[PDB]
């Protein structure tokens, strides 16, 4: 059970790292998109 | 510019599908984690 806990905690950390980068990638694209739609 | 617009929107949609799944995966693991911590 202790190893299950550890692996669960590692998976959760791995998901947090993915979410951090993807949310930054989305925010950067939303900003660029807003600029482009204003231009168009 | 029109091509940039289309690709930005496709990328944002792909990022939103990833975020939806990754957040559900994280929430499910947090739920399991609390249960495991209660067992332990």
């Amino acid at each position, epitope marked *: 059970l202790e190893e299950e806990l550890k692996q669960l905690e590692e998976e959760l950390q791995a998901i947090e790292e993915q979410l*951090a*980068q993807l949310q930054w990638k989305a925010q950067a694209r939303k900003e*660029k998109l807003a600029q482009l739609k204003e231009k168009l | 510019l029109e091509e940039e617009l289309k690709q930005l929107e496709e990328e*944002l949609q*792909a990022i939103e599908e*990833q975020l939806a799944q990754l957040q559900w995966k994280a929430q499910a693991r947090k739920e399991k984690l609390a249960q495991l911590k209660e067992k332990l």
Partner: nanobody
Amino acid sequence: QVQLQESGGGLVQAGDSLRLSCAASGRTFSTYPMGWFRQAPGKEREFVAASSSRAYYADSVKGRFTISRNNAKNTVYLQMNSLKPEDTAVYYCVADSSPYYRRYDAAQDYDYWGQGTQVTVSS
């Protein structure tokens, strides 16, 4: 087509500072993570720094090097202080154009690579 062009390398003495520049000239790069890798003699390309939601640094350069970006100019920079002979390497600018997850410290997860600039730190 799309490229990343590094400049600012050269020969330097131990203890000096140096600033590397990388101009991205393909398309917009403000939505892409950008970073630096290096290859020293007889070693593999190794992670130096990356910039996205935040700055990341290899342990070997933390507190001596700073990564920064000028989004308007489509450029990324590597500010280097307290240079040592083991910092001698070819320094490569990199970019990640993927909308999918990519690991900031894995060379294979960057799809755009500059040609590299040589930095030499004499003892």
